[PDB]
Design an enzyme around this catalytic site. Structure first.
Site, PDB file in Angstrom:
ATOM      1  CE  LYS A 113      -1.981  40.890 -11.246  1.00 29.80           C
ATOM      2  NZ  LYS A 113      -2.333  39.550 -10.586  1.00 29.80           N
TER       3      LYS A 113
HETATM    4  C1  LIG Z   1      -1.900  38.053 -10.922  1.00 29.81           C
HETATM    5  C2  LIG Z   1      -2.209  37.077  -9.960  1.00 29.81           C
HETATM    6  C3  LIG Z   1      -1.575  35.512  -9.930  1.00 29.81           C
HETATM    7  C4  LIG Z   1      -0.882  35.340 -11.132  1.00 29.81           C
HETATM    8  O1  LIG Z   1       0.614  36.344 -11.480  1.00 29.81           O
HETATM    9  P1  LIG Z   1       1.606  36.317 -12.550  1.00 29.81           P
HETATM   10  O2  LIG Z   1       2.704  37.337 -12.131  1.00 29.81           O
HETATM   11  O3  LIG Z   1       0.495  36.810 -13.611  1.00 29.81           O
HETATM   12  O4  LIG Z   1       1.748  34.900 -12.941  1.00 29.81           O
HETATM   13  C5  LIG Z   1      -1.980  34.748  -8.935  1.00 29.81           C
HETATM   14  N1  LIG Z   1      -2.716  35.101  -7.937  1.00 29.81           N
HETATM   15  C6  LIG Z   1      -3.165  36.304  -7.431  1.00 29.81           C
HETATM   16  C7  LIG Z   1      -4.085  36.281  -6.329  1.00 29.81           C
HETATM   17  C8  LIG Z   1      -3.124  37.277  -8.416  1.00 29.81           C
HETATM   18  O5  LIG Z   1      -3.778  38.562  -8.318  1.00 29.81           O
END
Ligand SMILES: *Cc1c(COP(=O)(O)O)cnc(C)c1O
Length: 464
Positions: A113
């Site tokens: 993120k």
């Molecule tokens: C949010 C997250 C995901 C999933 O991502 P999306 O874009 O919502 O599909 C997978 N792994 C981790 C570590 C995350 O923080």
């Protein structure tokens, strides 16, 4: 220049800046580009040798519709990725003869993120300044998203950020990342209640229209177009390392709310040669069941060792639904109406076939995920977190073809040490630059679980 339309077909058509600030559309839908910027094979060949930042400027600029001058955009992209402690920003590590892990965890919170947040917070700061506005960012977290948000918005000029999290119920690493950032425009609010309570207070504030207006409230969530847009870049950079555009590349994405893999879809729409896009889920496998049956049906949420993928519904799946129905907004409205009333819908044959023609899906249970961490450590000396291990497990089960496979590693193993230790006996180690994290002074305010108490704190502390 670039316009943005809603998946539900009856919202104002917006420019980039407005789409960035609008978030969710007036009609309840999600914003998408009216058309996708295109790259020919030669235009992709022309990206060879370029830095992550340079590729990002090439790939992202068309989406901004000329609203951010080039010099300003190539300060904010440079600054965003300067926060990543790796010269490649998102580097590959080879794990088998035709398999690579794309490490998305070299940024400030060791999780994927960061890629979108660090740019989103700067783009938003720029758009707000240009309009003489400020914003009060408000969100709730169980630990990880709040950190990413606070590290992105910390120290921005035109925003103050308030993250609510449950008192005593956040993991130590995650809590410290929210509360020890040292920025004066960051407010970590430890609510005497659970995560659901934090979410209810946030929904409360957003329902209070006078409050939102007075404080210029804006949300933290997975559905703003600018959480997705920046993620397009690393599909290009990874594929270029492997020889794009002269051979196609496949990707497997540990997926919760679909924004990550949807960005890969966008890359493909722009002309990046992609063979498979593979959705990797935990036991909360709505997306896997959907690809198998067409039945997107809500079931109870299981707690797993990959909590960032513990989803009941996938918030950005609607963007793919829109594309798969040939941008038939009435069809999308119908399906979402079905979800809201009855907890599921069935995708009809033509759009379901379109989804299946470009996507597949698999699942990894807690035991399968642990087994994958242990085998990859044993065979390669390489340590995966659980979310990333889900990706590797499913990639190996679902991969078909001769294309190289890139598996997205979405968090550093040190972000989920319990599960990693349980799987393979290793207590993962933080990167050296973060080795002092557990000694940093926390700074947060404990508040009771009451809407008026939280609103008063926000009102008193926001500069908005
Ligand atoms: C949010 C997250 C995901 C999933 O991502 P999306 O874009 O919502 O599909 C997978 N792994 C981790 C570590 C995350 O923080």
């Amino acid at each position: 220049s670039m316009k943005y339309v809603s998946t539900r077909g009856e919202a104002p058509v917006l420019g980039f800046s407005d789409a960035l600030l609008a978030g969710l559309a007036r009609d309840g839908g999600l914003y998408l580009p009216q058309e996708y910027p295109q790259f020919t094979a030669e235009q992709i060949r022309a990206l060879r040798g370029k830095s992550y930042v340079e590729v990002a400027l090439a790939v992202l600029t068309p989406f901004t519709g000329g609203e951010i001058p080039a010099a300003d955009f190539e300060r904010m992209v440079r600054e965003a990725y300067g926060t990543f402690r790796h010269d490649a920003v998102c580097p590959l590590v080879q794990t088998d003869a035709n398999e690579f892990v794309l490490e998305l965890f070299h940024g400030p919170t060791l999780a994927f993120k960061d890629v979108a947040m660090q740019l989103l917070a700067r783009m938003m700061d720029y758009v707000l300044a240009q309009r003489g506005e400020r914003a009060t960012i408000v969100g709730a977290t169980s630990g990880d998203t709040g950190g990413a948000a606070i590290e992105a918005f910390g120290g921005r000029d035109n925003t103050d950020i308030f993250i609510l999290f449950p008192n005593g119920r956040v993991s130590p690493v995650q809590q410290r990342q929210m509360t020890s950032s040292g920025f004066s425009n960051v407010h970590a609010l430890s609510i005497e209640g659970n995560f659901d309570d934090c979410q209810n207070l946030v929904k409360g504030m957003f329902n209070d229209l006078e409050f939102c207006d007075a404080l210029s409230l804006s949300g933290v969530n997975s559905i703003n177009w600018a959480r997705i847009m920046p993620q397009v870049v690393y599909y290009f950079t990874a594929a270029l390392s492997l020889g794009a555009p002269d051979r196609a590349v496949s990707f497997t994405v540990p997926t919760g709310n679909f924004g990550d893999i949807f960005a890969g879809y966008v890359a493909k729409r722009m002309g990046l040669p992609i063979e498979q896009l593979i959705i990797a889920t935990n036991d909360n496998d709505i997306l896997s069941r959907t690809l198998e049956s067409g039945a997107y049906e809500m079931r109870g949420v299981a707690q797993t060792t990959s909590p960032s993928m513990d989803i009941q519904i996938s918030s950005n799946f609607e963007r793919l639904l829109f594309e798969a129905h040939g941008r038939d907004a009435a069809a999308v409205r119908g399906l979402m109406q079905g979800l809201k009333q009855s907890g599921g819908f069935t995708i009809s044959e033509k759009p379901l076939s379109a989804i299946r023609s470009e996507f597949s899906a698999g699942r990894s249970t807690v035991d399968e995920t642990a087994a994958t961490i242990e085998s990859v450590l044993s065979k390669d000396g390489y340590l995966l977190d659980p979310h990333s291990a889900i990706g590797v497990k499913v990639a190996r089960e679902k991969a078909s073809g001769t294309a190289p496979m890139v598996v997205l590693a979405t968090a550093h193993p040190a972000k989920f040490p319990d599960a990693v230790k349980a799987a393979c006996g290793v207590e993962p180690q933080l990167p050296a630059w973060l080795c002092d994290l557990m000694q940093r002074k926390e700074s947060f305010t404990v508040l009771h679980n009451e809407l008026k108490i939280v609103e008063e704190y926000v009102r008193h502390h926001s500069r908005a």
